[PDB]
């Protein structure tokens, strides 16, 4: 019902990609602390690249909690932020489905460790894994717990006219919950 915009200020030190990654992960940690399954996001200017604007959706008091908590403290300067406001009355909707493959090197190593696959099975696994590809917009996320840098992918539904109530899991992307798109 309420949303906030964050526009990336491109820098010589950090180009739009790195900024996007860091502010996204900071938003993630924010949601981890705030423990809310209800705070969402979208990427309005996305056009094959998530774009330079990250829009957060949710309750006005929660967005106020975000502004006040100053989650993204260091990086405030690269960012330009509008005040919280109610969404416009005429608005379409779309979910955000994080697209992740069921195939990975760790899973292959796991299948070898479980004794579940043959030598040729490894080859067919690799051909099926590297054969597929995602043209979808992605972001490379740095981590701590797993201590890895992993590529997460995003996909969205097309212009659903009606909202569907749902959970926003961790990073704010929603699977089955449609955020306002404008």
């Amino acid at each position: 019902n309420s949303y906030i915009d964050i526009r990336l200020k491109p820098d010589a030190e950090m180009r739009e990609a790195e900024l996007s990654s860091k502010v996204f992960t900071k938003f993630h940690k924010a949601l981890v602390t705030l423990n809310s399954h209800k705070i969402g996001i979208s990427f309005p200017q996305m056009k094959l690249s998530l774009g330079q604007l990250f829009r957060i959706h949710g309750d006005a008091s929660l967005l106020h909690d975000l502004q006040g908590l100053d989650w993204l403290g260091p990086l405030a300067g690269y960012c330009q932020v509008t005040a919280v406001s109610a969404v416009p009355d005429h608005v379409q909707y779309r979910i955000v489905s994080v697209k992740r493959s069921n195939l990975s090197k760790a899973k292959l190593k796991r299948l070898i460790a479980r004794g579940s696959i043959d030598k040729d099975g490894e080859k067919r696994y690799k051909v099926k894994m590297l054969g597929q590809g995602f043209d979808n917009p992605y972001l490379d996320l740095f981590s701590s717990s797993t201590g890895q840098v992993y590529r997460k992918f995003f996909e969205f539904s097309d212009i659903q006219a009606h909202p569907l109530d749902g959970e926003f899991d961790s990073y704010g992307l929603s699977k089955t919950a449609t955020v306002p798109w404008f």
Binding site: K105, K123, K126, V127, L130, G131, G133
Partner: protein, 267 residues
């Protein structure tokens, strides 16, 4: 003193498979970007459509291979990027030479067509890991091989961390990273040395195994193309022959019989 004995280098043969072009050279002439092709020139004393892929085969740059292979200060030095891959920092002159040497990955399949794209590709390659460059890390600016500018406590702390990291690679083994103020290479007529860190047999083997492991599972994902390493053959070379595996494959030794050669001694 005397002569150096043991395993001089760890060579290997890589055979990989894929589809499409993994590594492109760029757009060169009506014009086309192309892909890296060995021995190709567009100049006549030319049209894009005239090429013989048998004479000028597709290949992947060692640079690309390395980039996707490693996919990645004290932290730099303790990283695999520091130990196996090499590095240079423009400020001052701090560097480390990569013990890893890689030939081109050469496609044996002649399937081209008018961008210029590719069908099924089969790459063959060779490579080596140099024990001399791997086991020793020069911390001294004397020979300008200096990895870092260090403090006596930073010296000892660095040795320790590397020991810790290399330990984190293979828990079964018990690696040793030994710092010393003077390390002299075998064969000098004078005793002159640099402050640095020497790595024990377990550490060196752990690093070699890690590198070979990364090589065996190595895969590259390009928009319209991909590569995965199919087979890998490894040779532990105690001989004076370079690329023994390349010239003669009857003399190859798969499992390590001998301890690694020690090229340096503290003094």
């Amino acid at each position: 003193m005397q002569k150096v004995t043991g395993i001089k280098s760890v060579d290997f043969k890589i055979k990989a498979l894929g589809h499409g072009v993994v590594n492109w050279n760029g757009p060169t002439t009506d014009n086309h970007t192309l892909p890296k092709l060995r021995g190709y020139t567009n100049l006549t004393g030319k049209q894009a459509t005239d090429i013989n892929f048998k004479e000028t085969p597709l290949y992947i740059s060692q640079n690309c291979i390395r980039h996707h292979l490693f996919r990645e200060l004290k932290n730099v030095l303790a990283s695999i990027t520091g130990l196996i891959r090499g590095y240079v920092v423009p400020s001052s002159q701090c560097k480390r030479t990569s013990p890893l040497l890689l030939e081109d990955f050469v496609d044996q399949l002649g399937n081209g067509n008018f961008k210029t794209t590719f069908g099924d590709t089969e790459y063959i390659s060779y490579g080596s890991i140099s024990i001399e460059q791997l086991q020793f890390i020069s911390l001294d600016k004397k020979f300008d091989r200096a990895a870092m500018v260090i403090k006596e406590g930073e010296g000892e702390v660095i040795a320790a961390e590397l020991q810790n990291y290399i330990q984190s690679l293979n828990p079964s083994l018990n690696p040793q990273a030994i710092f010393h103020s003077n390390y002299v290479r075998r064969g000098t007529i004078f005793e002159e040395g640099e402050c640095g860190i020497l790595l024990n047999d377990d550490a060196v083997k752990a690093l070699v195994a890690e590198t070979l492991e990364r090589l065996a599972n190595l895969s590259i994902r390009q928009a319209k193309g991909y590569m995965y390493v199919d087979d890998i053959t490894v040779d532990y070379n105690d001989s004076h022959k370079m690329m023994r595996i390349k010239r003669d494959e009857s003399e190859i030794i798969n499992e390590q019989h001998a301890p690694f050669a020690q090229y340096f001694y503290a003094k």
